[PDB]
């Protein structure tokens, strides 16, 4: 397809956005200045992303195009691409593209980027055997049969579609980087064929069995976040792993992890773990996430001298002191535990994020010199004192101490009681099983600001 005679740009390129670009691309002052076929022949690459383009009518005349970026447009029809057989690379993500038949014969393509469209039928991909990179996330694909001869593929995504059946991957032994996340995938048996896999991302699926991964010894990154994993015995064979994400599963036994000493990120939050002794030789960790488990003794963690990021929120932790070993911590999370003495945190010079809400913390003085904090949390503490004897005029000391070392005055005090530093004093006519008080005090340490708040219960005998 070719123009004969000099022709206004705005009559080849009917799109306002695109004639504007092609005006510049071809080097012309006005969208009405004419161009000939030879002018058009010299355009071999085009970067027309993010220009609000609604049509690519006219791109057919750029017969020598090898590489195009029309990502982030409003394209639907892509029919002007049909005969551009010299195309090797297409980036066309984030359009409203439904029909990809116009791609069917673009046989020389090695890179094809189609994520965020509304594609269902990928049968037009079948003959594109030179493809080594293909991206199809965030479309509405149920059937991948059309990938079966794409035996040059190295990089492949179709995250967030509705593909259950991975059988059509069986012969793509060249694959190295695969993402199958958010599909309805239960059975990954076919992945056992993919011996060259270095990266596998399979988050938010319904995978309970990982024995297919066993011979996949070249994997260095695996993400199985949000599955139904429990037995991970298989992972002990993947000694090349450096990045392992297993959060949101049902995992309790971590011994298969012990020898995976090249790991620098491990995620294991929202599992069923009480024992982290298998973790102690993983000294190369920088990120460890252990939130939402069943932890109490976190002493194995003191070994992990390199960590800069640690999550521990929603466990059953009393003794925070192993973390004080971890001199290079920049972000620490332990909301919703049972920590009281925070004084071992004193030796965390590098801490920026300290997230310590809903624990049993009465005294902030040991955090005074943590002046690189830019994000802080300390609200909704609680504790119950050991009981004391009921007297009509019973009194207890306020123990709540701010970062300055001054006591924080109670916000409220049950049973009509009242305060004179340091003491809270009730005037109680008949036996009552318990009295209480609250506090609530805005505080900033360095540049991190929180409300330090709590409820203290006092049982009476």
């Amino acid at each position: 397809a070719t123009i004969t005679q000099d022709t206004p740009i705005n009559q080849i390129f009917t799109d306002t956005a695109l004639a504007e670009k092609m005006k510049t691309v071809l080097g012309k002052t006005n969208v009405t200045d004419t161009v000939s076929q030879t002018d058009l022949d010299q355009v071999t690459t085009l970067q027309a992303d993010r220009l609000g383009i609604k049509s690519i009518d006219g791109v057919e005349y750029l017969n020598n195009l090898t590489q195009i970026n029309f990502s982030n447009n409003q394209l639907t029809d892509i029919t002007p691409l049909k005969n551009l057989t010299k195309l090797v690379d297409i980036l066309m993500n984030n359009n409203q593209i439904a029909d990809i038949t116009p791609l069917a014969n673009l046989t020389n393509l090695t890179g094809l980027t189609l994520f965020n469209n509304q594609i269902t039928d990928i049968d037009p991909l079948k003959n594109l055997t030179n493809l080594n990179r293909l991206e199809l996330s965030s479309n509405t694909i149920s059937d991948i049969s059309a990938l079966s001869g794409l035996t040059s593929l190295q990089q492949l995504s179709f995250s967030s579609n509705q593909v259950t059946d991975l059988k059509p991957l069986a012969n793509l032994t060249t694959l190295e980087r695969l993402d199958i996340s958010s599909n309805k995938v239960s059975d990954i048996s076919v992945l056992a064929k993919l011996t060259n896999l270095e990266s596998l991302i399979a988050t938010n699926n319904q995978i309970s069995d990982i024995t297919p991964l066993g011979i996949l010894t070249n994997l260095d990154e695996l993400s199985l976040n949000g599955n139904q994993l429990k037995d991970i015995g298989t992972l002990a064979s993947l000694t090349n792993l450096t990045d392992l994400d297993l959060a949101n599963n049902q995992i309790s036994n971590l011994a298969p992890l012990s020898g995976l000493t090249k790991l620098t990120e491990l995620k294991l939050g929202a599992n069923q773990i009480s024992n982290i002794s298998p973790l102690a030789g993983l000294t190369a960790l920088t990120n460890l996430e252990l939130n939402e488990n069943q932890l109490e003794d976190i002493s194995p963690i003191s070994n992990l001298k390199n960590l800069t990021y640690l999550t521990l929120y929603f466990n059953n932790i009393s003794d925070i002191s192993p973390v004080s070993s971890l001199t290079k911590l920049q972000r620490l999370f332990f909301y919703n535990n049972k920590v009281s003495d925070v004084s071992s945190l004193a030796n965390l010079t590098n801490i920026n994020w300290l997230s310590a809400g809903h624990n049993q913390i009465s005294d902030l003085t040991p955090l005074a010199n943590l002046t690189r904090i830019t994000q802080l949390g300390l609200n909704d503490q609680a504790w119950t004192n050991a009981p004391v004897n009921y007297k009509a005029n019973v009194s207890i000391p306020n123990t709540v101490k701010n970062v300055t070392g001054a006591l924080i005055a109670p916000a409220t005090i049950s049973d009509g009681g009242s305060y004179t530093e340091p003491d809270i004093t009730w005037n109680l006519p008949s036996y009552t099983n318990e009295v209480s008080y609250t506090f609530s005090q805005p505080v900033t340490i360095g540049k991190g600001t929180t409300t330090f708040s709590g409820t203290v219960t006092q049982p009476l005998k």
């Binding site: 993010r50 990502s71 982030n72 980036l91 993500n93 984030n94 890179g111 980027t113 994520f115 990179r133 293909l134 991206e135 996330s137 990089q155 492949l156 995504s157 995250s159 967030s160 980087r177 695969l178 993402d179 958010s182 991302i201 988050t203 938010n204 993400s223 976040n225 949000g226 959060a247 990120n287 939130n291 800069t308 990021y309 999550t311 929120y313 920049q330 972000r331 999370f333 909301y335 994020w353 997230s355 994000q375 802080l376 949390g377 991190g448 600001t449 929180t450 409300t451």
Partner: protein, 104 residues
């Protein structure tokens, strides 16, 4: 405070990464997800303003993804903000400023 229930790892992405895209950087998390569903979004340059959509976030799961390779001698850094809402449209958190460093 601004922390609220935010839980977010530091973000730095190598330039010239290989596909496939999008590629997960970190999962952004509000611990208010314990009271009910939280819905996640991002704003900033690289997000909703030019260059638009270099970064995206999955709105159920909080997965923050880069959608293309980066080049360090073009933009070496990016500043975004995260956002957490309930089904009701209500902020459950104060938007958090996020630094994304492009690395070697």
């Amino acid at each position: 405070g601004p922390l609220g229930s935010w839980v977010i790892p530091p973000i730095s992405c190598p330039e010239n990464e290989k596909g496939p895209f999008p590629k997960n950087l970190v999962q952004i998390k509000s611990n208010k997800d314990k009271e009910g569903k939280v819905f996640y979004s991002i704003t900033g340059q690289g997000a909703d303003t030019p260059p638009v959509g270099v970064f995206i976030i999955e709105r159920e799961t909080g997965w923050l993804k880069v959608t293309e390779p980066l080049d360090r001698e073009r933009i070496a850094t990016y500043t975004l903000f995260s956002h957490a809402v309930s089904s009701n449209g209500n902020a459950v958190e104060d938007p958090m400023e996020i630094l994304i460093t492009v690395t070697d």
